[model samples]
Target: ERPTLPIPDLLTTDARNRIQLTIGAGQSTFGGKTATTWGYNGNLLGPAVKLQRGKAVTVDIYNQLTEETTLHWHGLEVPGEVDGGPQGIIPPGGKRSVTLNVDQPAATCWFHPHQHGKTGRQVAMGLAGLVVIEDDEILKLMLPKQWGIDDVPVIVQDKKFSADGQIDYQLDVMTAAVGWFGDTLLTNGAIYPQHAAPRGWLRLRLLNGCNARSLNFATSDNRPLYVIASDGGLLPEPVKVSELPVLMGERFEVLVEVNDNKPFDLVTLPVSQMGMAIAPFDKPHPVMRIQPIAISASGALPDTLSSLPALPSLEGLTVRKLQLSMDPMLDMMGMQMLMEKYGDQAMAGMFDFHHANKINGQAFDMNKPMFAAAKGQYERWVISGVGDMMLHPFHIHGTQFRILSENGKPPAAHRAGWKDTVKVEGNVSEVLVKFNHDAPKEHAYMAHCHLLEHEDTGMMLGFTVG
Candidate 1:
């Protein structure tokens, strides 16, 4: 529990822009006991919402837990009735307030608990947080805006434990068909942690907040990993990678250098795909351990970082393709008798209860809708991956797209920019969406597969912007 880098208790924006957030149900010790969590106002994770873009905050949200949930703001774009997804659920002594208006761009957003099959066990029991969207073009970037030090907010989770050490919300179905894979490794909620910082450049915003794993973040002294921002934020220049790949609800904003002597580890390597190395996706841990203090660093590290938005030319767009199946109805002797009697919580409650995993073959019908847009139209999706050899990070709720290529080349270089999640395996990717909010008539704005157990087992799908 290498303390010091816990700076998550800030709610900037005073003089009335509002901020109340209170999703209770506590207990936080981790690896030491007193597990069983679910936070938002502290016990584990919550409080780091400093928005600013177009201003207009105002968020009350107060569901004292015990049942319902849905505070998804995981990269907002507003308008799907406040874009909280799962029809904006909030019961169980509800309170819902929502007033958002932070019209995009300044990157690194987050806020979890998207009730579907309980979004991967309430974000693996610890709701989630961290959403910083300031503007004036990132305060005229000069890098490292100090938050926990030289800019830092690195949440990276993975779990499994139980032998009285609690926190083992069991689940199976191969961890619900290729998704939930954790053996233990958490940051922020501590555990084998380390972080002392202070030397030179150090801006990591990296957040993969795992559910179905997918991180490749390197630098065990293999340096050279500067990526500006991602998951919808800065990135017009600045893309020198060595290992990045951050799936599962994505978010990246690297830039490491901190030297003066040595001491770096932020590892996690061995992630291979589109070519072997498999098994719940190969392993290799170590999430933080960057000791080196004698403090130093005062801004001045920008090699161009934001001008993006100029690749929207798919002609008269509007062309969907979607397909990412799974669900032979739990075969293989019914998943070997549910993994020989309840393993991984019975495949995470029958593949996260809903349908199993289907998108083209439908399964997640809040009274169906899976395709429709026009509130300033523009589309060209084409996310592929079928019949099994899975890996799909898709995701899209509200807006943010542009990644026109994957199986047909062009898309690396830190994946260009502006995205709301995209990693679609078995290539044939492609994206260009643009259906700005008009969403309502019973909430509808989700393009799942963010692997929260494959979006609570049904690979999800739903659209509407009329």
Candidate 2:
């Protein structure tokens, strides 16, 4: 059964000036009652931030979770200590103080708990937010959209929860192997609901905030959609496309000009039918409902989206490759879904089935150091995912990176810019990145799948250098 939820409006441009944040496990409404829901500011997820580039910012994060928790600035170029990697956790009854300096170029970023092994459950239950960095260059484009009231931040995901609205992340093997799927849909925080937009140009920011779900979005609600940016932020030039692949941990921003001539619904379709999609398809299902209005002839998108500056070459640093793989255990565990996925006989002689998501045949181990390097060295990392499993988005701490190449081919278009995260779409996807700063004091940095569940089960890792 699906529960009702309230829609979250992206806090406005002005609100971005000072994005004050805090993390806590608290109660929220769903199933018509108050139940435990994790959050940043108040409700599920946190407030959407619209920050201008080159502007120094400060955000205080208070951990109110029952246990040790840390808030990682998922996609920003901050110092290692402030990066909120693995070692960046606050213990039970512990509080931490952090200041975010949004000095990077314009792009969509996010924030959430980085509690190794439990990131999935924490984020799955709720505990994430959008962080937007807009520089002067992208700001000059003819793109203008209202944040708080007009523009909306769309977070896509599926949820299967308890009858009382509490999130029960514990899934059996079959369901867990296929990944958890929810019936109802939500935007920001609200559930299957409609939204209104003035005619002319409308702005929409996208974030795949689901626990492990991947969404294939199209404008069934409206066609001829506009495109301004992808996961790495602004495109070198605007490209028009109807369908976009939205995966966990990635973000997309666009300015759709609404014509008063036609009324449209910003329709979204999930790629439930894998073989029937233009782009590679996965879980084909219904994800979002966008209602667009054609008000008048005078709405305008800011001439500029946000400044996207050129990236410096990382030719001076050593490169390392990290291969990730995932596996599922058939028996000998406290899980119900396991019986459903593999069957009782599947556990014969133990270790019967496996759908592994590991790094070099290793899953996430909170106490292990995956990789350690000297500070301030430009380095390249090839992040990949293998098997019939879904796509995984790799987010790094400390700085953003340009997509040097995909697979082995130089990128077709401009993917070079500041990016804290990138979507690794292949069971063997690849990304070239550089770590340009030092490891913050005693804090460790991390890179992992945006899939909260995978992160929780052991598909992630962290490394720290003294």
Candidate 3:
């Protein structure tokens, strides 16, 4: 009982280099019922917007939703003003225009609402889309470039559905403290979707759009996945792997070669928690079915995709420690005190753990700067988990980072590249980051757990780069 995977409508800039996105409420028919949702331009989800490097682009975001929301470019490296942080707001029935120079390399970024405490709810209720960046250099590679043919966008998210096929986002105390878990898997807004492609090598821009779930993606054909890109852009080369661990808010470009007359499934295996993986969670969830129907003109997989300069030595780098803490009791007490003092204004924008989770003993405060760095300084961030035995995907905006080590050992081969988000579990994860963009004192860069629930509550911090 799976629906055919729908190819998202592609949108390129017009002659004036402008793209219009209308955020409006609508209903999408899934299964036998129509579910209420929000979208950009149309009903559910938005069209794929393609941008080129070295060019100036303007996007007009019209807010038609009942409440105010902000459209954040999740992985784009633009100036802090156009970066769409929590400070960027668009009131209901209002509109905002952002013009930025696209200077980054070719990458797969995304767009979603990042309005402080309503991020998780807004994203879960739709209002998400894909942003594809292309450059002259990436066009020279021997890769598939046809949209929905050899190259496609695969957004993986999980959700719980009601009996009438509507999405239910009811979170309890524990679920809010950690994150939300869904019972159903969705690929590109479709349940158990399938795609028929020509037999040859293809490229999939994979994005983990789930609020908190981490996907261990693999192919049922058992063929090795050639990973060519990470959060920021192209990797040093293709890293061969049987399975790839993609966490929330992370993006990867994987190349897979499909043969003729075969149907292969892209699936997310059950997650393993604790000493050993228990039942239910150990089962596999099928995301997409790729069937090769015919042969077509396809290109060969190149030995190399992109190049990178040598990394700087970490002889005397500034080291910063970020501890992840999630305590239910602490959060309850904090919110209770805030409610008594601040009144409804405090409770209006607070989630379950909006007062509980912390990074370095402090929650996210819009007026305070959590950290600061110069424009050309390189720092080492040591991220460790505490309080609970849960996995968190840490994400830093504006700049990509290099994984130095994990628990005193080098990171995996697929993780050894420029990345903006890294998975941190029980062990310590260290990364070397270089800031090249200027984040003003008021408009800062945010770093937080990719679990949208955790981020919406309090596990977020902002830093300035100047």
Candidate 4:
């Protein structure tokens, strides 16, 4: 028998518009065996924090862990001071308060650890949650609004467990090179979980919370999955598709029709079509089982979901080309340089293969700012993949962007909406981006690969907006 899916605790702001979160360690059971894990407020993952559009909210984060960590609100368009990048470090038993003025539309964003070099291990141990934003426009839409019942949060993560039932966070050369890939799958912290959903148009807020794996979401019954929203928020309209490909740190709000009282599996098909010429991984697996129950009330999806603003003018637009590269010689040189700079003690448990991940021939430097952009200035970024045929999910902090083209052509209907993450599928991806907040030199924004291992290894760059 499959275990029932566990919905994360829904958290709302207090009278002072404050939400408190404590990061601590706890124990959990997987495959009937107990293991140590970390979470927010409770044991395993964090809570689903709810925020309203145009409302000011303060997030009080307490770090109860033995070490340090930074809470990054992924996909949220907040200022650099509250963006929770690598610079915003919260020491052990320390607390930091960040106030955010919600300006973006309602979307399924997330928060996770963004500690400089320990992100992969920390996230693998379990420190991630959802941020469900709402607004007046979202309330007017005739969609499933019930939390954990008709509207479900699906955080899909793949992990590896040791013989003692503890999470195995070991990284080898191959894994460091191509990012980590686990053998076991967990949805919302449950192994082989099943959701007893109400029979109707069930909304699944899908988030690819993996370290490196890209999920190709599809139903076992081959029914069309109506995609209602992307990373930033609801699309102009719902785009129906048989399969939806979601990369790391990306979110998609999809509606699946559960008209009959039957069980169907939401599975990930084999990822052979992602254009990986070398070291292709990821097999067909079930993410979650949906057991639809009979319900009297059914909801209809509106024809138009939300109104998106017109594209900015292209006159004198700043176009920049960013190349994601990997090289063995560069890795060796980088590792040698780091050893000379930081000594062998600092490079003790680190792998040399991780040094291969770089952007524009440079690894991530805490003191370096790749470029500077004026606030509210639109810029066209052409992100290209160089060296190998590895697909990289590129993500930018502090703003949502619009995909202008992918591989020299326009994006698909499902990807034409607002996004903060884009899949560079071994080719080129072009996005029109603009920042609305100020990021000083001390706490600048970041643009990096969503693959945790790659990001932790330094496939990232920083920029300032003023």
**Index of the highest-TM-score prediction:** 4
Clashes of each: 9, 53, 1, 0
lDDT against the true structure, per candidate, is 0.77, 0.60, 0.79, 0.85
- Model 4: residues >4 Å from true position, as ranges? 273-283, 329-351
Minimal lDDT window, size 10, model 2: 273-282
Over 1-466, each residue of candidate 4 has an lDDT whose tens digit, in order, gives: 9999999888998887789999999999988899999999988888999999999888899999999999999989989999999999999999999997999999999999999978888899999999999999998888997888889999999887899999999555545555665667899999869998888888999998988877889998798899999999999999999999898899999999886777999988766422111122234578899998876545668899988888888789999788887777644544455346445442222236656688898888879989997788999999997555555899999999999987658989988889998877568989999999999889999999888877887789999999
Instruction: For candidate 2, write residues 1-466 as lDDT tens digits.
Output: 3332244545543365444566767776644656678887786788766667666666656676777777877677677778876678787666666666566667777877777656666776788887767777764565654553345667765565777667767544443344454554566666554556666677777777766666656665546655677665777665566776666777777666555555444545545311122221223344444444544333354434455555546666666676765553522232344445445432332242323456667766656768886565456777775443345666666666676665446543434444556666543434445555556436666667666655555566667644
lDDT computed for candidate 2:
0.60
| Candidate with the greatest lDDT versus the true structure | 4
Model 1 error, position 220 (Å): 28
Worst 10 residues of 1 by lDDT: 273-282
Off by over 4 Å in 3: 273-281, 328-352
What TM-score would every model get versus the actual structure?
A: 0.34, 0.80, 0.91, 0.92
The order of the candidates by lDDT, greatest first, is: 4, 3, 1, 2
Model 2 TM-score relative to the real fold: 0.80
lDDT of 1 by residue, 122-240 (tens): 88887899898888977888887877787888898877767887677644565566555556778877875767777888888888887877778888778888898888888888888
List model 3 lDDT by residue over 144-187, tens digit each.
87788878899988776788778788544544554665666678
